[PDB]
């Protein structure tokens, strides 16, 4: 109260000083009980690859990825590479290919090669890529007879749209069918390197999910109910109590949403029940004092909470179950304004001295000592 | 096998308050949800046929069939219907459904008697044989075919009706529950059916949906439809 009012003397009255909040006690995480590991040897190391204009998908699905082994062979999009290791999803889409040194930045969510004309990487890309430079190992002139580059067509394609037709296309003033002319060209030419193919490994991560099959290397813990806990359900972090919902979820539904843009309920990844996301109890703190000219004894009102959701046992609150750094008080009384700690309730009615709420007022009277 | 048939002029009918499906997988209950999505416009002109004409697929098609028994046994989806691009075929063969994405090569008038739908099924890339989508002129079947980038969403409903047989697509409301979510990466611009018949087209509109205590839609209002609805 003194630091809020910026004074060493406090007048008589009730003062709103801080907010009562409850710490999470257990820090729990819930992942599906999987014991598999990702075979990254097939991911990083291979000898034959598909083309720059028609690449394929070696999808590593249902395999628990670890990203500390990334540098055994970078650019990263969507999620920064320090925290791909805690995300959870269902499938990993592999989108690997080969490139040229003048094409190292043209297959991207942003920046301009044959991939924009025959098979394209999306701009809304939520995966992380690996930039491997393989001239110093695979030393040769021609990469492959199936690796070819071109300059333009008459129209661009969508991401993952495949059209590898070998025909002259027209951006000029006349149609051409095997005819050279103004913007009638067939620029599809094969690679010829000088001192050597280069290779990129892409792992696209999906959205709009089923219940998740793949997680990070974090070890899941036990489920704690009816207490304020710090939870993590398949990447969904938060703090609150986990009670049973009694909600009619369909089996393909994994999350329930309230009025606001947040999650109200979540399906447990292991035991498949439905748990409410209810944040643990809080309220304003009101400090009732008769004035530092009169006394230093104060009473504390925790607004809008029960007397069971508040620190009552002041001798065991050095273990910090609450965001309140201290805990004082002797007498505990329940008021519709909140749980009042520090004032002894009497059955005698007096004129209102310090208002609290719902017909209850506080005063500093003689009972014989002052309290 | 190609077989010769008789061409007829089309008819038109009213849509009433019919053609509302579940837009998302999130289970909302006891609310009023404002959504901006593909829907059939209310009180629109639904094209009514009795033949099997080749119709466009203008970004989602509401389909309905009123019949006594199993007559219309499936659908055909694609851009071109020769052996040049891939296409989708759904056949409700008596005790099963066969769903194929292949290259295909159809005849001019595909129909079910025997099987004369196509001639070749080279390079089959998706197949799904399961419980037939068709269920139970008393029978009414509703479907919504929505081709989003990556997915082909079919929504369905089956209803025993007792109305007048011509010009009487019945008034009332029935939400169309999701039936199947095909993971097909093909372009779809045109569709055909296999042998009443109703085809309406979806448009991006704004709807107000009423979610009850059981999570089932029981009322839908279109602001665009009327100022009071707005």
């Amino acid at each position, epitope marked *: 109260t003194k630091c809020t009012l910026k004074s060493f003397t406090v007048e008589k009255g009730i003062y709103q000083t801080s907010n009562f909040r409850v710490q999470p006690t257990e820090s729990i995480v819930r992942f599906p009980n999987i014991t598999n590991l990702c075979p990254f040897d097939e991911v990083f190391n291979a000898t034959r690859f598909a083309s720059v204009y028609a690449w394929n998908r070696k999808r590593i699905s249902n395999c628990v990825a670890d990203y500390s082994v990334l540098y055994n062979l970078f650019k990263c999009y969507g999620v920064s590479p320090t925290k791909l290791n805690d995300l959870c999803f269902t499938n990993v889409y592999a989108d690997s290919f080969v490139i040229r040194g003048d094409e190292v930045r043209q297959i991207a969510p942003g920046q301009g090669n044959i991939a924009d004309y025959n098979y394209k990487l999306p701009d809304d890309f939520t995966g992380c890529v690996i930039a491997w430079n393989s001239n110093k190992l695979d030393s040769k002139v021609s990469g492959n007879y199936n690796y070819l580059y071109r300059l333009f067509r008459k129209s661009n394609l969508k991401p993952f749209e495949r059209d590898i037709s070998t025909e002259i296309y027209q951006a000029g003033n006349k149609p051409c069918n095997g005819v050279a002319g103004f913007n009638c060209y067939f620029p599809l030419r094969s690679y010829s390197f000088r001192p050597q193919p280069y290779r990129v490994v892409v792992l696209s991560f999906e959205l709009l999910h089923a219940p998740a*099959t793949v997680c990070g290397p974090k070890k899941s813990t036990n489920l704690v109910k009816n207490k304020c806990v710090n939870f993590n359900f398949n990447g969904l972090k938060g703090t609150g109590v986990l009670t049973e919902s009694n909600k009619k979820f*369909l*089996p393909f539904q994994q999350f329930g949403r309230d009025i606001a843009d947040t999650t109200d309920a979540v399906r447990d990844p292991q*035991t498949l029940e439905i748990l409410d996301i209810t944040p643990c109890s809080f309220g304003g703190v009101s400090v009732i004092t008769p004035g530092t000219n009169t006394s230093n004894q104060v009473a504390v009102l925790y607004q809008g909470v029960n007397c069971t959701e508040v620190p009552v046992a002041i001798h065991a609150d050095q273990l910090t179950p609450t965001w309140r750094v201290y805990s004082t008080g002797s007498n505990v009384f329940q008021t519709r304004a909140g749980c009042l700690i520090g004032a002894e309730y009497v059955n005698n009615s007096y004129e209102c001295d310090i208002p609290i709420g719902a017909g209850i007022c506080a005063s500093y009277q003689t009972q014989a000592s002052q309290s | 096998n190609l077989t010769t048939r008789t061409q007829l002029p089309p008819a038109y009918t009213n849509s009433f308050t019919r053609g509302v499906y579940y837009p998302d997988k999130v289970f909302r209950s006891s609310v009023l949800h404002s959504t901006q999505d593909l829907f059939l416009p209310f009180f629109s002109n639904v094209t009514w046929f009795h033949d099997n004409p080749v119709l466009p697929f203008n970004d989602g098609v509401y389909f309905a069939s009123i019949e006594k028994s199993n007559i219309i046994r499936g659908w055909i989806f694609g851009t071109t219907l020769d052996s040049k691009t891939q296409s989708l075929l759904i056949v409700n063969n008596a*005790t099963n459904v066969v769903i194929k994405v292949c290259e295909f090569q159809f005849c001019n008038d595909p129909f079910l008697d025997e099987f004369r739908v196509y001639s070749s099924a080279n390079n089959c890339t998706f197949e799904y*044989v399961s419980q037939p989508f068709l269920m139970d002129f008393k029978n009414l079947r509703e479907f919504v075919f929505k081709n989003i980038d990556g997915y082909f969403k079919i929504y369905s409903k089956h209803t025993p009706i007792l109305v007048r047989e011509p010009e009487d697509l019945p008034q009332g409301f029935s939400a169309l529950e999701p*039936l199947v979510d095909l993971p097909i990466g093909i372009n779809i611009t045109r569709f055909q059916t296999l042998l009443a018949y109703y085809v309406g087209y979806l448009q991006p509109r704004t709807f107000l949906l009423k979610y009850n205590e059981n999570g089932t839609i029981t009322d839908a209002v279109d602001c665009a439809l009327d100022p009071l609805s707005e």
Partner: antibody
Amino acid sequence: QVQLQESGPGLVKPSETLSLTCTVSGGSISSRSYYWGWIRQPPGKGLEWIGSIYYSGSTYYNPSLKSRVTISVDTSKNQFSLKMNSMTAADTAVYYCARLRGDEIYYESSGYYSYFDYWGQGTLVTVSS
Amino acid sequence: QSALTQPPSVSGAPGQRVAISCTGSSANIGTADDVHWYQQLPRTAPKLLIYGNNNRPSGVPDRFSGSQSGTSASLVITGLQPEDEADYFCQSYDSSLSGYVFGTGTKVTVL
């Protein structure tokens, strides 16, 4: 010619380790790309479902078997394994391997129904002893 | 979730119509979708006998079928055979839990 062979021991004490293996006899039908399940039937009681697996993942479990024990499919060896670790006293029963329905190719679909069509012979396990 | 009410037994006099039924809630059978009946001879695997509320698989004869309508599903068996003395089970797909609920069974006895 669709037959389902089943294997697994039949007598354990409570808190013991056991596993049931289900193999395909060799028919291409009910071999690789199908939905699968296990059915438990107590002696003197009716059928009741315990286990089901859909494509690679997407496992649905009985409320009795929700976190009780897991299930696995080795697709290449046509092996359908249901672990049986530390069973409670009510699991003395005959167990059946069963294919649902539905061939599917190359993708991961989303169907809202279920089946059981072909059934194994059934293996008896005793745990109340 | 299940609510599956099924009679325990019914008279199985041969050459005579036997109608059996199971009724659940309005979430699995009342959706008019995915209810199966299984036939189980004693010491024999319970094969899939009829599916799709009336749809008959390969090998199952005629005059012996299903008549589901709404919340109640029912089999009609006209002309009971001596090989049809078995136990008949239901199975329905619910949307709230998908617990794949089964019936208690109707053990037919011939006389």
